[PDB]
PDB file of C-alpha atoms and ligand atoms in Angstrom:
ATOM      1  CA  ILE Q   1     -10.016 -11.932 -11.239  1.00  0.00           C
ATOM      2  CA  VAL Q   2      -7.297 -13.318 -13.271  1.00  0.00           C
ATOM      3  CA  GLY Q   3      -7.337 -16.706 -14.329  1.00  0.00           C
ATOM      4  CA  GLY Q   4     -10.537 -17.548 -12.645  1.00  0.00           C
ATOM      5  CA  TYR Q   5     -14.014 -18.740 -14.192  1.00  0.00           C
ATOM      6  CA  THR Q   6     -17.283 -16.837 -14.697  1.00  0.00           C
ATOM      7  CA  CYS Q   7     -19.254 -17.627 -11.331  1.00  0.00           C
ATOM      8  CA  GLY Q   8     -22.823 -18.015 -12.733  1.00  0.00           C
ATOM      9  CA  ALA Q   9     -25.710 -14.987 -12.294  1.00  0.00           C
ATOM     10  CA  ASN Q  10     -26.079 -14.624  -8.681  1.00  0.00           C
ATOM     11  CA  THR Q  11     -24.427 -17.483  -7.710  1.00  0.00           C
ATOM     12  CA  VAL Q  12     -22.680 -15.335  -5.409  1.00  0.00           C
ATOM     13  CA  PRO Q  13     -25.382 -13.980  -2.961  1.00  0.00           C
ATOM     14  CA  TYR Q  14     -23.690 -12.112  -0.440  1.00  0.00           C
ATOM     15  CA  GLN Q  15     -21.530 -10.335  -3.241  1.00  0.00           C
ATOM     16  CA  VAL Q  16     -22.041  -6.343  -3.810  1.00  0.00           C
ATOM     17  CA  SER Q  17     -20.817  -4.077  -6.294  1.00  0.00           C
ATOM     18  CA  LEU Q  18     -19.705  -0.516  -4.920  1.00  0.00           C
ATOM     19  CA  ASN Q  19     -20.733   2.433  -7.033  1.00  0.00           C
ATOM     20  CA  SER Q  20     -20.353   5.858  -7.142  1.00  0.00           C
ATOM     21  CA  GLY Q  21     -21.300   6.192 -11.096  1.00  0.00           C
ATOM     22  CA  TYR Q  22     -19.632   3.406 -11.571  1.00  0.00           C
ATOM     23  CA  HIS Q  23     -17.883   0.056  -9.885  1.00  0.00           C
ATOM     24  CA  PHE Q  24     -15.094   1.248  -7.848  1.00  0.00           C
ATOM     25  CA  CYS Q  25     -14.661  -1.905  -5.152  1.00  0.00           C
ATOM     26  CA  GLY Q  26     -16.430  -4.907  -4.341  1.00  0.00           C
ATOM     27  CA  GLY Q  27     -17.947  -5.588  -0.681  1.00  0.00           C
ATOM     28  CA  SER Q  28     -19.798  -8.514   1.222  1.00  0.00           C
ATOM     29  CA  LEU Q  29     -23.196  -8.448   2.911  1.00  0.00           C
ATOM     30  CA  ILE Q  30     -23.134  -9.179   5.838  1.00  0.00           C
ATOM     31  CA  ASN Q  31     -26.672  -8.366   7.255  1.00  0.00           C
ATOM     32  CA  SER Q  32     -29.831  -6.715   5.713  1.00  0.00           C
ATOM     33  CA  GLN Q  33     -28.661  -3.658   6.287  1.00  0.00           C
ATOM     34  CA  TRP Q  34     -24.525  -4.044   6.708  1.00  0.00           C
ATOM     35  CA  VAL Q  35     -21.636  -4.276   3.885  1.00  0.00           C
ATOM     36  CA  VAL Q  36     -18.186  -5.217   4.942  1.00  0.00           C
ATOM     37  CA  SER Q  37     -14.951  -4.085   2.456  1.00  0.00           C
ATOM     38  CA  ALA Q  38     -11.493  -2.709   2.191  1.00  0.00           C
ATOM     39  CA  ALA Q  39     -11.093   0.850   4.040  1.00  0.00           C
ATOM     40  CA  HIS Q  40      -9.019   1.645   1.210  1.00  0.00           C
ATOM     41  CA  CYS Q  41     -11.963   1.374  -1.379  1.00  0.00           C
ATOM     42  CA  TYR Q  42     -13.208   4.386   1.111  1.00  0.00           C
ATOM     43  CA  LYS Q  43     -14.854   7.086  -0.606  1.00  0.00           C
ATOM     44  CA  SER Q  44     -18.244   9.381  -0.459  1.00  0.00           C
ATOM     45  CA  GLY Q  45     -21.526   8.996  -2.574  1.00  0.00           C
ATOM     46  CA  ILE Q  46     -21.475   5.245  -2.329  1.00  0.00           C
ATOM     47  CA  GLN Q  47     -24.499   3.545  -3.623  1.00  0.00           C
ATOM     48  CA  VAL Q  48     -24.682  -0.293  -2.728  1.00  0.00           C
ATOM     49  CA  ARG Q  49     -25.697  -2.699  -5.899  1.00  0.00           C
ATOM     50  CA  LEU Q  50     -26.933  -5.921  -4.489  1.00  0.00           C
ATOM     51  CA  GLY Q  51     -28.172  -9.095  -6.833  1.00  0.00           C
ATOM     52  CA  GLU Q  52     -25.863  -8.085  -9.714  1.00  0.00           C
ATOM     53  CA  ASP Q  53     -24.076 -10.345 -12.685  1.00  0.00           C
ATOM     54  CA  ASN Q  54     -23.683  -7.926 -15.181  1.00  0.00           C
ATOM     55  CA  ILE Q  55     -22.949  -4.680 -13.853  1.00  0.00           C
ATOM     56  CA  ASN Q  56     -23.591  -2.967 -16.840  1.00  0.00           C
ATOM     57  CA  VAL Q  57     -26.980  -4.531 -17.213  1.00  0.00           C
ATOM     58  CA  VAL Q  58     -30.414  -4.198 -15.350  1.00  0.00           C
ATOM     59  CA  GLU Q  59     -31.494  -7.823 -15.445  1.00  0.00           C
ATOM     60  CA  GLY Q  60     -34.027  -7.847 -12.525  1.00  0.00           C
ATOM     61  CA  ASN Q  61     -32.531  -9.228  -9.144  1.00  0.00           C
ATOM     62  CA  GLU Q  62     -30.961  -6.144  -8.576  1.00  0.00           C
ATOM     63  CA  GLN Q  63     -31.439  -4.176  -4.876  1.00  0.00           C
ATOM     64  CA  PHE Q  64     -29.546  -0.195  -5.958  1.00  0.00           C
ATOM     65  CA  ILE Q  65     -29.552   1.473  -1.950  1.00  0.00           C
ATOM     66  CA  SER Q  66     -27.505   4.361  -1.408  1.00  0.00           C
ATOM     67  CA  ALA Q  67     -25.353   4.036   1.845  1.00  0.00           C
ATOM     68  CA  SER Q  68     -25.788   5.941   5.011  1.00  0.00           C
ATOM     69  CA  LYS Q  69     -22.983   6.183   6.678  1.00  0.00           C
ATOM     70  CA  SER Q  70     -19.508   4.301   6.295  1.00  0.00           C
ATOM     71  CA  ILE Q  71     -17.381   3.540   8.960  1.00  0.00           C
ATOM     72  CA  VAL Q  72     -13.421   2.728   8.608  1.00  0.00           C
ATOM     73  CA  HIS Q  73     -11.155   1.041  11.147  1.00  0.00           C
ATOM     74  CA  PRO Q  74     -10.238   2.779  13.745  1.00  0.00           C
ATOM     75  CA  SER Q  75      -6.816   1.874  13.049  1.00  0.00           C
ATOM     76  CA  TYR Q  76      -6.726   1.540   9.269  1.00  0.00           C
ATOM     77  CA  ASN Q  77      -3.140   2.737   7.969  1.00  0.00           C
ATOM     78  CA  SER Q  78      -3.529   4.082   4.089  1.00  0.00           C
ATOM     79  CA  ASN Q  79       0.026   3.761   3.844  1.00  0.00           C
ATOM     80  CA  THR Q  80       1.131  -0.047   5.035  1.00  0.00           C
ATOM     81  CA  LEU Q  81      -2.746  -1.318   4.216  1.00  0.00           C
ATOM     82  CA  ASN Q  82      -2.709  -2.646   7.926  1.00  0.00           C
ATOM     83  CA  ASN Q  83      -6.436  -2.972   9.132  1.00  0.00           C
ATOM     84  CA  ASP Q  84      -7.707  -2.558   5.681  1.00  0.00           C
ATOM     85  CA  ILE Q  85     -11.726  -2.861   6.377  1.00  0.00           C
ATOM     86  CA  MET Q  86     -14.419  -0.667   6.576  1.00  0.00           C
ATOM     87  CA  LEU Q  87     -18.493  -0.989   7.238  1.00  0.00           C
ATOM     88  CA  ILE Q  88     -21.095   0.682   5.154  1.00  0.00           C
ATOM     89  CA  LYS Q  89     -24.458   0.899   6.527  1.00  0.00           C
ATOM     90  CA  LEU Q  90     -26.873   0.756   3.867  1.00  0.00           C
ATOM     91  CA  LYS Q  91     -29.858   3.940   4.382  1.00  0.00           C
ATOM     92  CA  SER Q  92     -33.194   0.728   4.108  1.00  0.00           C
ATOM     93  CA  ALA Q  93     -32.415  -2.978   4.536  1.00  0.00           C
ATOM     94  CA  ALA Q  94     -31.895  -4.912   1.770  1.00  0.00           C
ATOM     95  CA  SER Q  95     -34.823  -7.532   0.982  1.00  0.00           C
ATOM     96  CA  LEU Q  96     -33.038 -10.861   1.194  1.00  0.00           C
ATOM     97  CA  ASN Q  97     -33.889 -13.576  -0.749  1.00  0.00           C
ATOM     98  CA  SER Q  98     -31.859 -16.677  -2.462  1.00  0.00           C
ATOM     99  CA  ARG Q  99     -29.689 -14.370  -4.869  1.00  0.00           C
ATOM    100  CA  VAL Q 100     -29.028 -11.421  -2.604  1.00  0.00           C
ATOM    101  CA  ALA Q 101     -28.060 -12.706   1.020  1.00  0.00           C
ATOM    102  CA  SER Q 102     -25.549 -12.476   4.033  1.00  0.00           C
ATOM    103  CA  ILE Q 103     -22.430 -13.708   4.331  1.00  0.00           C
ATOM    104  CA  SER Q 104     -22.061 -15.193   8.101  1.00  0.00           C
ATOM    105  CA  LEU Q 105     -19.031 -13.769   9.864  1.00  0.00           C
ATOM    106  CA  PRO Q 106     -16.221 -16.165  11.104  1.00  0.00           C
ATOM    107  CA  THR Q 107     -16.095 -18.423  14.268  1.00  0.00           C
ATOM    108  CA  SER Q 108     -12.793 -19.485  14.466  1.00  0.00           C
ATOM    109  CA  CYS Q 109      -9.669 -17.916  12.132  1.00  0.00           C
ATOM    110  CA  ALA Q 110      -9.672 -20.583   8.504  1.00  0.00           C
ATOM    111  CA  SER Q 111      -6.279 -22.283   8.347  1.00  0.00           C
ATOM    112  CA  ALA Q 112      -3.352 -21.997   5.757  1.00  0.00           C
ATOM    113  CA  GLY Q 113      -3.981 -25.109   3.021  1.00  0.00           C
ATOM    114  CA  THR Q 114      -8.107 -24.492   3.523  1.00  0.00           C
ATOM    115  CA  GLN Q 115      -9.509 -23.482   0.126  1.00  0.00           C
ATOM    116  CA  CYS Q 116     -11.893 -20.416  -0.441  1.00  0.00           C
ATOM    117  CA  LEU Q 117     -13.656 -18.907  -2.809  1.00  0.00           C
ATOM    118  CA  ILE Q 118     -12.479 -15.222  -3.848  1.00  0.00           C
ATOM    119  CA  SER Q 119     -14.760 -13.003  -6.051  1.00  0.00           C
ATOM    120  CA  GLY Q 120     -15.375 -10.235  -8.235  1.00  0.00           C
ATOM    121  CA  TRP Q 121     -15.511  -7.641 -11.442  1.00  0.00           C
ATOM    122  CA  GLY Q 122     -12.005  -6.449 -11.722  1.00  0.00           C
ATOM    123  CA  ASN Q 123      -9.621  -6.986 -14.220  1.00  0.00           C
ATOM    124  CA  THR Q 124      -8.684 -10.200 -15.728  1.00  0.00           C
ATOM    125  CA  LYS Q 125      -5.387  -9.526 -16.898  1.00  0.00           C
ATOM    126  CA  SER Q 126      -2.151  -9.536 -15.339  1.00  0.00           C
ATOM    127  CA  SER Q 127      -0.654  -7.542 -18.526  1.00  0.00           C
ATOM    128  CA  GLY Q 128      -2.889  -4.791 -19.421  1.00  0.00           C
ATOM    129  CA  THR Q 129      -6.367  -4.750 -18.939  1.00  0.00           C
ATOM    130  CA  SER Q 130     -10.326  -6.186 -19.588  1.00  0.00           C
ATOM    131  CA  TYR Q 131     -12.890  -5.782 -17.189  1.00  0.00           C
ATOM    132  CA  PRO Q 132     -15.431  -8.604 -17.599  1.00  0.00           C
ATOM    133  CA  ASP Q 133     -18.669  -7.245 -16.907  1.00  0.00           C
ATOM    134  CA  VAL Q 134     -20.003 -10.620 -14.957  1.00  0.00           C
ATOM    135  CA  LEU Q 135     -18.598 -11.591 -11.888  1.00  0.00           C
ATOM    136  CA  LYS Q 136     -15.915 -13.840 -12.152  1.00  0.00           C
ATOM    137  CA  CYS Q 137     -14.287 -16.522  -9.422  1.00  0.00           C
ATOM    138  CA  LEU Q 138     -11.897 -18.033  -7.705  1.00  0.00           C
ATOM    139  CA  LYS Q 139     -10.779 -20.919  -5.890  1.00  0.00           C
ATOM    140  CA  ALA Q 140      -7.841 -20.440  -4.172  1.00  0.00           C
ATOM    141  CA  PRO Q 141      -6.347 -21.660  -0.889  1.00  0.00           C
ATOM    142  CA  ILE Q 142      -5.140 -19.752   2.029  1.00  0.00           C
ATOM    143  CA  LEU Q 143      -1.242 -19.461   2.595  1.00  0.00           C
ATOM    144  CA  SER Q 144       1.010 -20.435   4.836  1.00  0.00           C
ATOM    145  CA  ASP Q 145       2.107 -16.926   6.746  1.00  0.00           C
ATOM    146  CA  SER Q 146       5.954 -17.896   6.516  1.00  0.00           C
ATOM    147  CA  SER Q 147       5.385 -18.165   2.575  1.00  0.00           C
ATOM    148  CA  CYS Q 148       3.670 -15.157   2.919  1.00  0.00           C
ATOM    149  CA  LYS Q 149       5.806 -12.962   4.185  1.00  0.00           C
ATOM    150  CA  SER Q 150       8.763 -15.145   2.521  1.00  0.00           C
ATOM    151  CA  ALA Q 151       7.053 -13.435  -0.622  1.00  0.00           C
ATOM    152  CA  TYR Q 152       6.479  -9.662   0.777  1.00  0.00           C
ATOM    153  CA  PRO Q 153       9.493  -9.104   3.448  1.00  0.00           C
ATOM    154  CA  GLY Q 154       8.638  -6.567   5.499  1.00  0.00           C
ATOM    155  CA  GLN Q 155       4.749  -6.037   4.530  1.00  0.00           C
ATOM    156  CA  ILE Q 156       2.479  -8.600   6.246  1.00  0.00           C
ATOM    157  CA  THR Q 157       1.086  -7.786   9.639  1.00  0.00           C
ATOM    158  CA  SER Q 158      -1.084  -9.899  11.943  1.00  0.00           C
ATOM    159  CA  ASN Q 159      -3.784  -8.575  10.082  1.00  0.00           C
ATOM    160  CA  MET Q 160      -3.197 -10.092   6.894  1.00  0.00           C
ATOM    161  CA  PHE Q 161      -3.005 -13.155   4.928  1.00  0.00           C
ATOM    162  CA  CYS Q 162      -2.229 -14.441   1.848  1.00  0.00           C
ATOM    163  CA  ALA Q 163      -4.218 -16.432  -0.530  1.00  0.00           C
ATOM    164  CA  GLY Q 164      -3.655 -18.079  -4.143  1.00  0.00           C
ATOM    165  CA  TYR Q 165      -0.720 -19.590  -5.758  1.00  0.00           C
ATOM    166  CA  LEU Q 166       2.854 -18.707  -5.708  1.00  0.00           C
ATOM    167  CA  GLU Q 167       3.224 -19.892  -9.581  1.00  0.00           C
ATOM    168  CA  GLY Q 168       1.250 -16.934 -10.254  1.00  0.00           C
ATOM    169  CA  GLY Q 169      -1.827 -17.113 -13.127  1.00  0.00           C
ATOM    170  CA  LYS Q 170      -4.475 -16.779 -10.472  1.00  0.00           C
ATOM    171  CA  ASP Q 171      -5.166 -13.762  -8.340  1.00  0.00           C
ATOM    172  CA  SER Q 172      -7.349 -11.469  -7.243  1.00  0.00           C
ATOM    173  CA  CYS Q 173      -6.845  -7.758  -9.429  1.00  0.00           C
ATOM    174  CA  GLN Q 174      -7.415  -4.414  -9.373  1.00  0.00           C
ATOM    175  CA  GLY Q 175     -11.285  -3.974  -9.365  1.00  0.00           C
ATOM    176  CA  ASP Q 176     -11.694  -6.658  -7.109  1.00  0.00           C
ATOM    177  CA  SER Q 177     -10.652  -4.800  -3.619  1.00  0.00           C
ATOM    178  CA  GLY Q 178     -13.209  -4.947  -0.730  1.00  0.00           C
ATOM    179  CA  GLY Q 179     -14.687  -8.032  -2.247  1.00  0.00           C
ATOM    180  CA  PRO Q 180     -15.118 -11.920  -0.018  1.00  0.00           C
ATOM    181  CA  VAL Q 181     -13.058 -14.391   0.530  1.00  0.00           C
ATOM    182  CA  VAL Q 182     -14.783 -17.249   1.844  1.00  0.00           C
ATOM    183  CA  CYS Q 183     -13.971 -20.248   3.323  1.00  0.00           C
ATOM    184  CA  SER Q 184     -16.467 -23.407   4.513  1.00  0.00           C
ATOM    185  CA  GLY Q 185     -19.244 -20.121   3.877  1.00  0.00           C
ATOM    186  CA  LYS Q 186     -17.645 -18.209   6.591  1.00  0.00           C
ATOM    187  CA  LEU Q 187     -16.170 -14.427   5.325  1.00  0.00           C
ATOM    188  CA  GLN Q 188     -12.438 -14.482   6.151  1.00  0.00           C
ATOM    189  CA  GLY Q 189     -11.183 -12.364   3.784  1.00  0.00           C
ATOM    190  CA  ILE Q 190     -11.347  -9.434   2.297  1.00  0.00           C
ATOM    191  CA  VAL Q 191      -9.345  -8.166  -1.628  1.00  0.00           C
ATOM    192  CA  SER Q 192      -7.041  -5.727   0.057  1.00  0.00           C
ATOM    193  CA  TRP Q 193      -3.508  -5.623  -2.040  1.00  0.00           C
ATOM    194  CA  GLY Q 194      -0.714  -7.688  -3.939  1.00  0.00           C
ATOM    195  CA  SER Q 195       2.344  -6.823  -6.305  1.00  0.00           C
ATOM    196  CA  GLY Q 196       0.410  -6.521  -9.674  1.00  0.00           C
ATOM    197  CA  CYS Q 197      -1.905  -9.806 -10.128  1.00  0.00           C
ATOM    198  CA  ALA Q 198      -0.812 -12.984 -10.690  1.00  0.00           C
ATOM    199  CA  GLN Q 199       2.790 -12.618 -10.716  1.00  0.00           C
ATOM    200  CA  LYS Q 200       4.952 -15.231  -9.526  1.00  0.00           C
ATOM    201  CA  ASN Q 201       5.582 -15.532  -6.186  1.00  0.00           C
ATOM    202  CA  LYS Q 202       3.193 -12.567  -5.477  1.00  0.00           C
ATOM    203  CA  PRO Q 203       0.311 -13.437  -4.003  1.00  0.00           C
ATOM    204  CA  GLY Q 204      -3.250 -11.654  -3.186  1.00  0.00           C
ATOM    205  CA  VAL Q 205      -3.252 -10.482   0.288  1.00  0.00           C
ATOM    206  CA  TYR Q 206      -6.148 -10.471   2.463  1.00  0.00           C
ATOM    207  CA  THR Q 207      -7.391  -8.789   5.238  1.00  0.00           C
ATOM    208  CA  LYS Q 208      -8.255 -11.392   8.345  1.00  0.00           C
ATOM    209  CA  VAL Q 209     -11.753 -10.829   8.641  1.00  0.00           C
ATOM    210  CA  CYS Q 210     -11.651 -12.997  12.145  1.00  0.00           C
ATOM    211  CA  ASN Q 211      -9.412 -10.089  14.112  1.00  0.00           C
ATOM    212  CA  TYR Q 212     -12.153  -8.163  13.412  1.00  0.00           C
ATOM    213  CA  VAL Q 213     -15.736  -9.772  14.523  1.00  0.00           C
ATOM    214  CA  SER Q 214     -15.672  -7.822  17.847  1.00  0.00           C
ATOM    215  CA  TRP Q 215     -15.692  -4.676  16.321  1.00  0.00           C
ATOM    216  CA  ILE Q 216     -17.863  -5.202  13.515  1.00  0.00           C
ATOM    217  CA  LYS Q 217     -20.282  -6.635  16.042  1.00  0.00           C
ATOM    218  CA  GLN Q 218     -19.845  -4.137  18.354  1.00  0.00           C
ATOM    219  CA  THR Q 219     -20.505  -1.097  15.938  1.00  0.00           C
ATOM    220  CA  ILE Q 220     -23.138  -2.898  13.777  1.00  0.00           C
ATOM    221  CA  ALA Q 221     -25.008  -2.854  17.547  1.00  0.00           C
ATOM    222  CA  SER Q 222     -24.624   0.981  18.214  1.00  0.00           C
ATOM    223  CA  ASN Q 223     -24.951   2.510  14.707  1.00  0.00           C
TER     224      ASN Q 223
HETATM  225  N1  8M2 O   1      -2.937  -9.327  -6.882  1.00  0.00           N
HETATM  226  C1  8M2 O   1      -3.730  -8.691  -5.776  1.00  0.00           C
HETATM  227  N2  8M2 O   1      -4.428 -10.109  -5.463  1.00  0.00           N
HETATM  228  C2  8M2 O   1      -4.372  -7.577  -5.615  1.00  0.00           C
HETATM  229  C3  8M2 O   1      -5.537  -7.283  -5.084  1.00  0.00           C
HETATM  230  C4  8M2 O   1      -6.003  -5.673  -5.329  1.00  0.00           C
HETATM  231  S1  8M2 O   1      -5.167  -4.755  -6.239  1.00  0.00           S
HETATM  232  C5  8M2 O   1      -4.130  -6.453  -6.400  1.00  0.00           C
END
């Protein structure tokens, strides 16, 4: 997260870190046994880490649970990042509490102008690299589809939305992918892609979760 703020320990209780020896992506806990992330985060050997604040320190609220399976969206295209969504099942159910908690799926798609909370452990620099070890947060509005398509000609599908600031300076970044965009208490986006980070006229692009609620619910019900 570039240009954000330190969330505070365990203030984003649905935020997870996906670990394969090291943190590589975020995710969102949507029930005691399932996480939503980005399809481009797929890899073998994922451990889901819940209750984290500093990802390099065991502070006392963590649960580390290996994935039993992952399900990349059937229509994910890794070249265009269309349908950049996957589901990860935990081998055992997490113990839910005030600091490890699921986030609700949306009932309706959120509108341009709505404020959202974007979070992650990714790079905090638009030029160069610095990883923060504690969770960073950014409040950002959803941008209009027209301004999103104008920013990224030929690249925005109906399964993506832009959020952030066209002036630059505040954005998600590398290492935040797969993490949450929460608006009015519902998971509306997944950190997906952007050109650089926090660049002028290059806002963050996010997977449009509301398009996937039926697929998420049906997949969970049979897996
Ligand atoms: N600029 C962004 N929002 C971004 C997201 C993942 S990598 C870069």
